[PDB]
Ligand binder design. Structure first.
Ligand code: HEC
Length: 89
């Protein structure tokens, strides 16, 4: 599901610290656009993957399974996925 209203509100405080504007801090190449996600998200460019990765915490990335609820797990994923797909980053 998701509503961008909520999803971005989380992003701003939670994700942006690394991925501000579809960026990174730790790995300045792994963004959140499709050219990154397609290869660097184990599972490839899918919402279900992003859901099932955001919670699990791939590599040098905090696991969100206990921070981000069945709501914002959907919320922020949907947000970044839209940006990614659209080129709206
Ligand atoms: C810095 C402490 C991070 C925070 C905060 C978040 N992410 Fe991240 N993410 C980070 C890194 C270094 C990586 C790559 C790890 C590796 O093994 O090299 C990622 C990866 C992602 C991906 C997959 C695509 C990619 O860039 O490799 C996605 C879809 C992603 N991250 C989403 C995401 C969201 C929505 C966050 C807030 C809930 C978030 N990340 C925080 C580092 C960091």
């Amino acid at each position: 599901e998701a509503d961008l209203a909520l999803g971005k509100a989380v992003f701003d405080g939670n994700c942006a610290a690394c991925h501000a504007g579809g960026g990174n801090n730790v790995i300045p190449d792994h963004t959140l656009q499709k050219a990154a996600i397609e290869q660097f998200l184990d599972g490839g460019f899918n919402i279900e993957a992003i859901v099932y990765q955001i919670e699990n915490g791939k590599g040098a990335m905090p696991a969100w399974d206990g921070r981000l609820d069945e709501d914002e797990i959907a919320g922020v994923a949907a947000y970044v996925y839209d940006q990614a797909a659209g080129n709206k980053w």
